[PDB]
Each structure stands twice: as C-alpha cells, then as structure tokens.
Write a protein that binds this ligand. Structure first.
Ligand SMILES: *[C@@H]1O[C@H](CO)[C@@H](O)[C@H](O)[C@H]1NC(C)=O
Lengths: 42, 49
C-alpha cells in the first residue's frame, strides 16, 4: 500500500512518503518523525 | 541576518534540486566528528543586509 523514497530515509531530512488508505492517497516529503517501519496496523 | 545562502557542497545542484541539508561538509583528509574544524565546514552563511 505505500513507499518511502529519499537518501537516508531517517525521519529527519527531506524524504518522500506515499500511502494509500483506500479513502485517499496521501503524500508527504516531511522533515519530520515517522516510525522506522510505518506499516498500517489494522 | 535573517536571509541565508549555501557556500559549499559535494557537487553542484541539479535543475530545481532543493537541498536543506545542514551537515558539516568534509573538504579533505580529516573526519568532522559532528563539528567544524580542519577540512570541515558548516555549509550555510548569512548576507547580513
Ligand atoms: C485517509 O487519509 C485522510 C487524510 O488525508 C483521512 O481523512 C481519512 O480518514 C483516512 N482514511 C482512513 C480509512 O483512515
């Protein structure tokens, strides 16, 4: 359902994130905190 | 001093490349250890208009 792209993928620098959640497609590049493995915990 | 520019990098930017990275630029033999020093420079500067 999704992808991370970038150089370091560290949740610190600029890095593309793409997620499908069935209601929407959500895209971010954020210089911001995420999980080290942000799977959808259904 | 609120307006800033980059002065150094590994290589010149590609068309519309938008690199924020603030890590110490290593320009030679010595490692930078997370600080400025010999061969090791902070990549941003201010105009100070
Ligand atoms: C999908 O993401 C949007 C925010 O972009 C959110 O409003 C929506 O509730 C999400 N859908 C689900 C099923 O969580």
């Amino acid at each position: 359902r999704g992808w991370i792209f970038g150089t370091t993928l560290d949740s610190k620098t600029q890095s593309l994130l793409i997620v499908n959640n069935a209601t929407n497609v959500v895209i971010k590049v954020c210089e911001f905190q995420f999980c080290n493995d942000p799977f959808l915990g259904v | 001093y609120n307006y800033l520019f980059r002065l150094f990098r590994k290589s010149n930017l590609k068309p519309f490349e938008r690199d924020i990275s603030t890590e110490i630029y290593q320009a030679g033999s010595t490692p930078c250890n997370g600080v400025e020093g010999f061969n090791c420079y902070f990549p941003l500067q201010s105009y100070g208009f």
